[PDB]
Design a binder for this molecule. Sequence first.
Ligand SMILES: C=CCOc1cccc2c1-c1c(c3c(n1C(C)C)CCCC3=O)C2=O
Ligand SMILES: [Cl-]
Ligand SMILES: [Cl-]
Ligand SMILES: [Cl-]
Ligand SMILES: [Cl-]
Ligand SMILES: [Cl-]
Ligand code: NA
Length: 333
Amino acid sequence: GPVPSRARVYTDVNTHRPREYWDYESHVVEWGNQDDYQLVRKLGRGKYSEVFEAINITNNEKVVVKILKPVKKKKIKREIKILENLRGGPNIITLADIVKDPVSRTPALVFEHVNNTDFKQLYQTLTDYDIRFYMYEILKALDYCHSMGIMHRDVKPHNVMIDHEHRKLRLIDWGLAEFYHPGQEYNVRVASRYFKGPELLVDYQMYDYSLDMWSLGCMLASMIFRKEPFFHGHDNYDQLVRIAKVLGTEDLYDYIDKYNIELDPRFNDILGRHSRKRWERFVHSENQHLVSPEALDFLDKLLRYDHQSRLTAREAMEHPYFYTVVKDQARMG
Ligand SMILES: C=CCOc1cccc2c1-c1c(c3c(n1C(C)C)CCCC3=O)C2=O
Ligand SMILES: [Cl-]
Ligand SMILES: [Cl-]
Ligand SMILES: [Cl-]
Ligand SMILES: [Cl-]
Ligand SMILES: [Cl-]
Ligand code: NA
């Protein structure tokens, strides 16, 4: 079988916490009163939800209400426990309440902050400075949730919200998130195709927080090269083929061997041999101003086949790519 793996950071954070922290199946949800919230208008639809602006008539504050499509009870409890555990963390959506429709019993999550713009509507026209600024903010969220023992597992541009007027960023959509426990095997169907890490594509189940760092690298490459998505696979196998045509097959086969992963031999016949490409292959007159030596060094260190070799969120925060932007002077407009 495959060789085991352990996270090299935050490995035991859930172990050191009480069982109640992470045993979401045992958690009893304290539901609120749906009558406190009146929906004002529709913001959008989701893979498993409908999203509204609403008013909290008990304090006259505007809120966001996410009404969930039917899910197994275990998964709603997981999402709620994770949001409660992360509440107050940097750049993470803030769960204000949870209610059920009185008639349909459909669960709805209430979040604090309005004034949202989906990051995917903005991230292809950012300055170099703004890419670095918002990348650092996403890193703060990932370092925090990883430090709280949680993998997000669906990092992508659509799951980042921006308060543009206030330069605030929030990581949203915690419905696929899970608690990291050393030795646990995890579902390989998570994340969206273009942001799936190699571990998901080869069905290696003993992965960890570093999955999120691969997805983040895919976002970075998309922004600095203005290519959406950066790895444009047409099916799960083609996703890996597209990655291998950039990173090369040599390090992919090294990864497969290291963890004793078994690939279907006939897919391996299709993967074949591909050399690692220069990043300047993706540099064009329209994106050259976004691409620096430190950007490419940082990207190289996120987009590693071996999940154990990828930068941690804290290591990423220390990278020279962010040397100047941490000095930001908090101008709003
Ligand atoms: C104008 C956009 C505001 O949109 C917000 C605002 C706050 C919080 C959330 C969203 C949101 C969420 C989710 C989705 N949107 C959107 C894209 C419709 C799509 C499906 C998955 C999902 O969770 C929020 O949690
Ligand atoms: Cl996306
Ligand atoms: Cl397991
Ligand atoms: Cl899982
Ligand atoms: Cl591609
Ligand atoms: Cl991390
Ligand atoms: Na609010």
